[PDB]
Design an enzyme around this catalytic site. Structure first.
Site, mmCIF file in Angstrom:
data_model
loop_
_atom_site.group_PDB
_atom_site.id
_atom_site.type_symbol
_atom_site.label_atom_id
_atom_site.label_comp_id
_atom_site.label_asym_id
_atom_site.label_seq_id
_atom_site.Cartn_x
_atom_site.Cartn_y
_atom_site.Cartn_z
ATOM 1 C CG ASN A 167 37.269 19.913 50.537
ATOM 2 O OD1 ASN A 167 36.071 19.617 50.639
ATOM 3 N ND2 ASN A 167 37.957 21.252 51.261
ATOM 4 C CG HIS A 216 38.972 25.127 53.482
ATOM 5 N ND1 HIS A 216 39.744 25.425 53.411
ATOM 6 C CD2 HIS A 216 38.020 24.603 52.579
ATOM 7 C CE1 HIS A 216 39.752 26.659 52.043
ATOM 8 N NE2 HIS A 216 38.427 25.773 51.638
ATOM 9 C CD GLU A 219 42.868 23.130 57.353
ATOM 10 O OE1 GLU A 219 41.861 22.385 55.700
ATOM 11 O OE2 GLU A 219 43.730 23.467 56.968
ATOM 12 C CB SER A 251 50.174 24.175 54.279
ATOM 13 O OG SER A 251 50.634 25.303 54.844
ATOM 14 C CB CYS A 266 43.671 28.363 53.471
ATOM 15 S SG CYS A 266 41.547 28.791 54.124
ATOM 16 C CB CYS A 269 41.874 26.596 58.049
ATOM 17 S SG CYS A 269 40.625 25.870 56.625
ATOM 18 C CG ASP A 299 38.562 23.512 49.247
ATOM 19 O OD1 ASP A 299 37.375 23.685 49.312
ATOM 20 O OD2 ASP A 299 40.048 22.786 49.334
HETATM 21 C C1 LIG Z 1 44.490 23.554 53.543
HETATM 22 AS AS1 LIG Z 1 42.875 24.243 53.004
HETATM 23 C C2 LIG Z 1 42.501 24.441 51.952
HETATM 24 O O1 LIG Z 1 41.858 23.086 54.130
HETATM 25 O O2 LIG Z 1 43.173 26.107 54.426
HETATM 26 ZN ZN LIG Z 2 41.539 26.297 54.758
#
Ligand SMILES: C[As](C)(=O)[O-]
Ligand SMILES: [Zn+2]
Ligand SMILES: C[As](C)(=O)[O-]
Ligand code: NA
Ligand SMILES: [Zn+2]
Lengths: 154, 153
Positions: B46, B57, B59, B84, B86, B89, B150
């Site tokens: 992140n 994020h 990912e 997990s 969002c 992502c 976030d």
């Molecule tokens: C698990 As996330 C807040 O990087 O989509």
């Molecule tokens: Zn995300």
């Protein structure tokens, strides 16, 4: 509903961003984020794949990046304008931030399952069928199809 | 066969989360592995605090760090994430056609994305990694307002 009074302002900004991106040699997809309460522009952007070597800066993502960091509550009364119906990632950004409205220039050159997924998740989608958006995106796809396919993971 | 790389992928993802923690950011890390040969296409964490970013994020940062790729490369990859994903992502995994997502944990956070990935034919493996749970819970204990920023809360 009544936030639709901002929709010509938002789509005009999104189209200006798409046309600027096109002039820079990139994918002509533009966006902006408007506060529904007073029409203020929180940010505007266009696709930066070719400009920055970016795998993630679709026009909608670039728009959100250009707004900067915001408290979560700010997004809850905004509209995201995009010249082209959003891919699943850009759809997911709208959903994650709780942006209630998405206004789309056109969905003829491209439509993912995201447009309908926004609606089934409770967001409003308006497709305005702006021919300026349709023409610039069709010109790009016709002239550089393999660059378009790269932008949507094909 | 791709599960053979999952210890390598989650170890890299955790290293990226720990580095983000040290830098004063949200401790969410990732990496994308080519299932064919185990090669690391990219790794990230992140970058909200580090870059003033509303979109990076863990990912998304991971995918940005891979650079531009032919679409065909993504089709035989695994995306590793310490937490997990969002809905954004999740949507990146779908848009690029990444077939597998291996998740450190879904205790501190889960979106409708986890199930939506499976509905749309992507394999999700939740490893329930204690290192990932601990670092994310520490961050949420210290800076819950930053975690909420976030995820648009
Ligand atoms: C698990 As996330 C807040 O990087 O989509
Ligand atoms: Zn995300
Ligand atoms: C309409 As798009 C390719 O910026 O998600
Ligand atoms: Na379609
Ligand atoms: Zn997109």
């Amino acid at each position: 509903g009544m936030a639709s009074k901002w929709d010509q302002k938002g789509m005009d900004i999104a189209y200006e961003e798409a046309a600027l991106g096109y002039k820079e040699g990139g994918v002509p997809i533009g966006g902006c984020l408007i506060n529904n309460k007073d029409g203020s522009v929180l940010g505007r952007g266009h696709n930066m794949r070719f400009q920055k070597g970016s795998a993630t800066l679709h026009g909608e993502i670039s728009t959100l990046e250009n707004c900067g960091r915001l408290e979560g509550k700010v997004y809850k009364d905004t509209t995201l304008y995009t010249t082209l119906s959003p891919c699943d990632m850009c759809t997911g950004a709208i959903i994650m931030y709780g942006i209630p409205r998405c206004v789309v220039g056109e969905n003829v050159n491209f439509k993912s399952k995201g447009e309908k997924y926004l609606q089934t998740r409770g967001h409003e989608v308006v497709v305005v069928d702006d021919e300026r958006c349709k023409k610039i995106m069709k010109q790009f796809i016709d002239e550089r199809p393999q660059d378009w396919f790269e932008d949507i993971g094909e």
